[PDB]
Write a protein that binds this DNA or RNA. Structure first.
Ligand SMILES: [Mg+2]
Ligand SMILES: [Mg+2]
Ligand SMILES: [Mg+2]
Ligand SMILES: [Mg+2]
Ligand SMILES: [Mg+2]
Ligand SMILES: [Mg+2]
Ligand SMILES: [Mg+2]
Ligand SMILES: [Mg+2]
Ligand SMILES: [Mg+2]
Ligand SMILES: [Mg+2]
Ligand SMILES: [Mg+2]
Ligand SMILES: [Mg+2]
Ligand SMILES: [Mg+2]
Ligand SMILES: [Mg+2]
Ligand SMILES: [Mg+2]
Ligand SMILES: [Mg+2]
Ligand SMILES: [Mg+2]
Ligand SMILES: [Mg+2]
Ligand SMILES: [Mg+2]
Ligand SMILES: [Mg+2]
Ligand SMILES: [Mg+2]
Ligand SMILES: [Mg+2]
Ligand SMILES: [Mg+2]
Ligand SMILES: [Mg+2]
Ligand SMILES: [Mg+2]
Ligand SMILES: [Mg+2]
Ligand SMILES: [Mg+2]
Ligand SMILES: [Mg+2]
Ligand SMILES: [Mg+2]
Ligand SMILES: [Mg+2]
Ligand SMILES: [Mg+2]
Ligand SMILES: [Mg+2]
Ligand SMILES: [Mg+2]
Ligand SMILES: [Mg+2]
Ligand SMILES: [Mg+2]
Lengths: 243, 117, 95, 215, 45
RNA sequence: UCAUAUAGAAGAACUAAUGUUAGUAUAAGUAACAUGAAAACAUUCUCCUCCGCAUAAGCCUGCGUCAGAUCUGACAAUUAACAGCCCAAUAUCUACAAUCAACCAACAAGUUAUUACCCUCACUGUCAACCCAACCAGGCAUGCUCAUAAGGAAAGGUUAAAAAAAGUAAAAGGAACUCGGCAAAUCUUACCCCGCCUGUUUACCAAAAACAUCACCUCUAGCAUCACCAGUAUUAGAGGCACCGCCUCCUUAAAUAGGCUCCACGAGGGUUCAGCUGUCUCUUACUUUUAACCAGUGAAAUUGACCUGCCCGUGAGGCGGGCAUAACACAGCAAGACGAAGACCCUAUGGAGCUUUAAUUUAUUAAUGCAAAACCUGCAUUAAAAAUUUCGGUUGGGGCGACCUCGGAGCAGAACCCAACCUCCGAGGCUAAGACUUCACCAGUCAAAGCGAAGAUCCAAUAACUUGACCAACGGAACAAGUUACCCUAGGGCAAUCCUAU
RNA sequence: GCUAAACCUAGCCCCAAACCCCCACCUUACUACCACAACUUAGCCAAACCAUUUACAUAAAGUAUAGGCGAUAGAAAUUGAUGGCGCAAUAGAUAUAGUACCGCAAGGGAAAGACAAGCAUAAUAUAGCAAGGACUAACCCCUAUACCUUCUGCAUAAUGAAUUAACUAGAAAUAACUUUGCAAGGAGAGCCAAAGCUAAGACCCCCGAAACCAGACGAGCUACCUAAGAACAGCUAAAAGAGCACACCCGUCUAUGUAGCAAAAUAGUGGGAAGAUUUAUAGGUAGAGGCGACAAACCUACCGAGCCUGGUGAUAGCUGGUUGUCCAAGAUAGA
């Protein structure tokens, strides 16, 4: 026979049926939405069209992203967007020589980074690209706060983002006690990434963590029906009395 | 080389034959040297009543009226259990009418069940 | 050739022919006398004259190449300044 | 393979412990070194090589007297049970060590070389030039790793500022800090070379087996 | 002489083909799942 | 749609794939199998067993009763003291063997103090003629009985043919048998080759002269907590060799057989003395199984159909020409029905290998060298380690060796064409009617007039005008050899020179 | 006359629509009850080898483009979007069932329910592909070298068939030809058009390798190793891989057996039998890998490379087959 929905619509169907159905709207929107990562390992074609030399006509061109592997060890660091390139090469860079296996891996370092909204020093593994992006962004905090989920591609980075966004949203005093002026300075410096708390709690959560959070949020000890029935009795008795 | 027939205590070598029970509850624990200590508390003491003078028998005469199936529902129980006390006291803060808010300080807990049929 | 493509299910042409032969619309095929560009220094002038020519292909070759090319390459083509515009048609053919 | 290596003891004691053979099998399960397996069951005596170890809450050079000098399956030399203070230790003995002898263990570098008895433990610098030493250590406070086998003499060659050059039995030199503690003499069980084992059964008893292959 | 390669032993049979040995590795869970799918009523030895 | 016809459709037709499934045949009522004797069914007798009893392991009700049949159902059972199922924590300790354990002699070197607890016997195995071998002269650990206190039955009945199997006896002779004294009977001797010895190996054709082995020698390695190793140059790993000492003409009557030193040993190989014997000269008798007959139960390979003869000829039960010839069981035999697994030669642009100085690679590792922030990342070079891949054609007798394209002379005497590893030698100006040709194509060849002057394709360098090597296996894979005695699959299989007589 | 022969439905196939559903149980699963963890398809296969390469709405278009520019691969812009000429018990699902049974395991995987052959009634009579011409007459007379497939024809040269019943093997484009519609236009958009277009009709099989690659299952047999156990009478000799010889282990030579008692046994004769011995029990090593006192020996009866599932209907210039009637044309230059 045949299903009533294709195979790739099953995920989107599941996101509407059960516990996943009660998640807040904005989290679902942030989850379903897809964005292409910024190019990292390939030179993107500048324009939508191009003249090729072999014939001379105006042919369309697209940029097809290289597929890159992120081993789980990166999820504990900030690799930027970089990663492994698993593929093949021609031996002598001539097409008539053997097709050989090849893996290109980034050059990783360990370093220390100071987060001001967190006022904490983290030890993180990174790559030269991550340092250059941080410098171009004028600080680690800005780099983690303005970059979107897709370019970071690091659960650690998204957790940092959730912490910083929650710290800004609450305006909680725990950043720098005994100097509120420094608190106000730091908080207002990043005043642009100020989103409400209800949206701050869910930033970066994977789907499973979201389901667990919703369950814990709604799980509750059933109310004794004694209270319910006595309430109904009291309502009926009051109605009878006022009549 | 037989895998369809059930697996029971009569099957393996000495060790298996000993370990595997036969659905029978335990009542104690093994101490040192394969010595068994029984506990008087883990042995179900039956509670049989005094049947003397009882006017009911295993069966009921065929000369009995029929009736309708009315299963007891929480509402039905509440209706004649506590409601009349409420109404009598409604003419002039819930534990006084039998409500039990928590179930740690009673011998027969209702949820979870700490007693037996 | 490929009588049915895996992705569409149509016939497919052998592009090694398109780059070698020209189909005059009404049947004939014209080629270019292999051996003509290279080694032109020990060939007699008459031989060089022969090799430059555009020659026709006999019946079996024409039927073969008709098989190796789909319908698109047999249509009626109205090109602006076609050096072969006048050869598309036979005139006064007896049998 | 569930292979918890037997060398799991942490506390030190003179009582033999229960060896488990390997047969050449490493933790994975494959023949890593061919030609090993079988042979007589053995127990292991934890021979202590830091021959200058002062007992709890004590210091300064200490004297110990031996009790017996017995065969040992694992070694090639003959171990000896030395008693000192309130402590017994298994230590590799030299050739001319009899039950009842006494031995000194010191870290005290004297003004000049102290004539040392043929079983005592002294820092390299403390010895004179041209003597024979055993149980040398690469660096101080580490333990004896170099010469330990049966009947092997290690000559001391020279001393310079803060270091000493010693000659290992393999006919080559090495430098070590002058505060490294060695023992003067020749390791016991001399002429262990001349052991004609006679028959393949003896090889099997020791632990070796004949293995073709070794790809 | 051959043919008697099966020297039965309950310990071995339950150790190298049993429920827990299958469930102690992804391949074994795949085996159990195949035999659940095909309908078998003897999933594990 | 008429309601067998006119149309439209389609899993649309089986004398044949060692086709598949089911039925029944043939060989065939053949091969093979089974129950010690008498009886009064209570019993007695004859004979046999390295067997029996128990635990373990395995199996799971698998000869208990009753009732139906020649196995089905119901009912019943194996009672824990034996065996399993264990342990409160922490620190401490825990040097000396076992061998009747004492003498000698060795080497392979073999639990408690404190803290916490005053609780009692629950749960499971318990049967049998049994398990692994499809049902079975096979396999099956331990304790005890060592010929049995326990357990069993080698002959369904008969007769005493052949051939076969096992055994007993044998006149005279005693290896004349034979490849060989294999088998059997008897128990002795001597040497030679190989290997030092005990051991190990081709489960299912090789137990050896092969492997291993003490002894010797060579090469590598200066050292921590997962092997070597809780080891350290008299150690560890990897190789060669094989202790130790010494060096780097007789035989027979007759004969192609036998005749670095080096004790001991060998189901190793060869030879010899003496004896022994049915091995033989030369077989014979008896017994047992088989056998043949009666009764019960009852297969399998094989089979185109058969109404299934001999001789000669052709190229043989079946054709031809002669001969023979009423039908039918039963037991034998092995000349014929090319009577029903295993080899050998050749082929495949089949498969899988092995070695390489056969082609391609360095992806992985190891060294370096260069950039990257004391270690990892990227690039390059060098090597080992591997990885993918192939084995042109004609042929003495397949191999060796030559040749492989084009051209000229006889075969092919007189249009054209016709083979050769048949016969003899070399070569690597433009435009345009019409035609010829190397038996295809691709190439190749001649050419009036007219106008002007007198060895393929693809690739790279190219503005170009076009250009080249290899492709000589010369219709050309862009770059691939030696070999398979371990191989696997698909398949094919009227004599120049001479011998002799008239 | 037996044996049989017959039957219908139990169900199933392809569509459409609709998004589908008390107790015990991860230890030895189905056991009331104590201190680690998951995150590029290679290759069979084509190129007639093989090495780069090789596929996973309609139209534009098999066009641009890619490619040992070979085999082949191949876009986009834009366009517009309850039923059955199905099976009916060897069919249809493998199904009454993933059960029985086979295998240690992964895994494999059934059958079936409602006067055909073979025989009997009734053995045969010279002689012969078992028939034909016939004959008053069954035989007797004359004629007469079985069938399929493969080799030049084959006497059977070779291969295949005991026999009956059921099931079992020609799927499609490019042109052309025939018949219709319309015809300088055809076509229900895209395409063709110098009589063409649109529609229909006709034509391209089955079984079979050794292999390759991927992921699972296997060391209850055997090779080796680990932990903790067990056995070795008697005699001779006293600390020895000692001698003779039981239990135990092996398997020298001969005979029996060869569908056997046994897919390697039996009887005798033999080697070892306190050791490098033999052995019960649990664990380990996993397939180009393990192990190996090297024999290409062994890794569950078949190992110069296990077994199972998948890619897989692998490929096969090779072998074998290929089914109604009747007629007609129809054969040996060569590169
Ligand atoms: Mg009809
Ligand atoms: Mg058909
Ligand atoms: Mg047939
Ligand atoms: Mg017969
Ligand atoms: Mg018989
Ligand atoms: Mg009991
Ligand atoms: Mg007990
Ligand atoms: Mg019993
Ligand atoms: Mg008896
Ligand atoms: Mg009998
Ligand atoms: Mg009889
Ligand atoms: Mg005689
Ligand atoms: Mg021997
Ligand atoms: Mg021998
Ligand atoms: Mg009979
Ligand atoms: Mg003849
Ligand atoms: Mg006969
Ligand atoms: Mg060929
Ligand atoms: Mg090949
Ligand atoms: Mg000529
Ligand atoms: Mg010719
Ligand atoms: Mg020509
Ligand atoms: Mg002229
Ligand atoms: Mg060629
Ligand atoms: Mg040629
Ligand atoms: Mg190919
Ligand atoms: Mg069926
Ligand atoms: Mg079926
Ligand atoms: Mg009939
Ligand atoms: Mg014949
Ligand atoms: Mg046949
Ligand atoms: Mg084992
Ligand atoms: Mg095929
Ligand atoms: Mg061919
Ligand atoms: Mg004709």
């Amino acid at each position: 026979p045949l299903h009533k929905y294709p195979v790739w619509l099953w995920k989107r169907l599941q996101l509407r049926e059960g516990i996943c159905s009660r998640l807040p709207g904005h989290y679902l929107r942030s989850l379903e939405e897809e964005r292409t990562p910024t190019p990292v390992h390939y030179r993107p074609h500048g324009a939508k069209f191009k003249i090729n030399p072999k014939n001379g006509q105006r042919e369309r061109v697209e940029d097809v992203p290289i597929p890159i592997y992120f081993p789980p060890e990166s999820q504990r660091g900030l690799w930027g967007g970089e990663g492994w390139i698993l593929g093949q090469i021609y031996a002598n860079n001539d097409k008539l020589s053997k097709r050989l296996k090849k893996v290109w891996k980034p050059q990783l370092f360990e370093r220390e980074f100071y987060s001001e909204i967190l006022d904490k020093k983290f030890t993180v593994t990174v790559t030269m690209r991550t340092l250059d992006l941080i410098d171009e962004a004028y600080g680690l905090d800005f780099y983690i706060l303005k970059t979107p989920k897709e370019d970071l591609c690091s659960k650690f980075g998204m957790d940092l983002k959730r912490g910083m966004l929650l710290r800004l949203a609450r305006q909680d005093p725990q950043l720098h006690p005994e100097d509120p002026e420094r608190r106000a300075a730091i908080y207002d410096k990043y005043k642009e990434f100020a989103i409400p708390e209800e949206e701050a709690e869910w930033v970066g959560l994977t789907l499973e963590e979201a389901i667990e959070k919703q369950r814990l949020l709604e799980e509750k000890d059933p109310v004794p029906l004694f209270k319910i029935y006595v309430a109904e009795l009291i309502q009926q008795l009051q109605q009878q009395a006022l009549s | 080389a037989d895998r369809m027939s059930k697996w029971t205590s009569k099957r393996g070598p000495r060790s298996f034959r000993g370990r595997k029970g036969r659905g029978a509850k335990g009542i104690g624990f093994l101490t040192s040297g394969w010595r068994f200590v029984q506990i008087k508390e883990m042995v179900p003491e039956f509670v049989v009543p005094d049947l003397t003078g009882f006017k009911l028998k295993p069966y009921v005469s065929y000369l009995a009226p029929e009736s309708e199936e009315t299963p007891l529902t929480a509402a039905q129980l509440f209706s004649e259990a506590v409601a009349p006390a409420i109404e009598k006291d409604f003419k002039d803060n819930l534990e006084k009418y039998g409500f039990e808010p928590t179930q740690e300080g009673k011998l027969f807990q209702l949820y979870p069940r700490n007693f037996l049929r | 050739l490929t009588y049915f493509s895996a992705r569409k299910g149509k016939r497919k042409t052998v592009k090694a022919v398109i780059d070698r032969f020209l189909r005059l619309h009404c049947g004939l095929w014209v080629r270019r006398k292999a051996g003509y560009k290279k080694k032109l220094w020990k060939k007699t002038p008459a031989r060089k004259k022969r090799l430059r020519e555009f020659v026709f292909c006999n019946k079996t070759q024409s039927k073969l190449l008709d098989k190796m090319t789909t319908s698109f390459w047999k249509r009626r083509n109205w090109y602006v300044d076609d050096p072969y515009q006048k050869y598309h048609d036979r005139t006064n053919l007896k049998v | 393979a569930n292979f918890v290596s037997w060398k799991s003891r942490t506390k030190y004691t003179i009582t033999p412990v229960k060896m488990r053979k390997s047969g050449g099998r490493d933790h994975t399960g494959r023949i890593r070194v061919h030609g090993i397996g079988g042979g007589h069951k053995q127990r292991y005596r934890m021979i202590d090589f830091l021959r200058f170890r002062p007992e709890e809450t004590k210091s300064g050079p200490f004297e110990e007297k031996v009790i017996q000098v017995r065969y040992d399956p694992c070694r090639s030399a003959d171990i000896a049970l030395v008693a000192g203070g309130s402590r017994k230790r298994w230590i590799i003995a030299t050739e001319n060590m009899q039950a009842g002898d006494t031995i000194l263990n010191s870290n005290h570098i004297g003004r000049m070389a102290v004539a040392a008895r043929e079983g005592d433990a002294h820092p390299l610098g403390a010895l004179p030039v041209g003597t024979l030493i055993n149980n040398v250590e690469s660096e101080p406070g580490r333990g004896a790793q170099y010469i330990r086998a049966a009947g092997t003499c290690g000559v001391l060659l020279r001393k310079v500022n803060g270091t000493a050059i010693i000659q290992l039995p393999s006919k080559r030199q090495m430098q070590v800090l002058e505060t490294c503690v060695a023992t003067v003499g020749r390791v016991s069980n001399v002429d262990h070379n001349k052991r004609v084992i006679g028959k393949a059964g003896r090889n099997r008893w020791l632990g070796k087996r004949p293995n073709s292959g070794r790809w | 002489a051959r043919g008697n390669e099966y020297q039965p032993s309950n310990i071995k049979r339950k150790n190298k083909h049993g429920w827990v040995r299958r469930l102690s590795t992804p391949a074994g869970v795949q085996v159990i799942l195949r035999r659940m799918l095909k309908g078998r009523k003897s999933l594990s030895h």
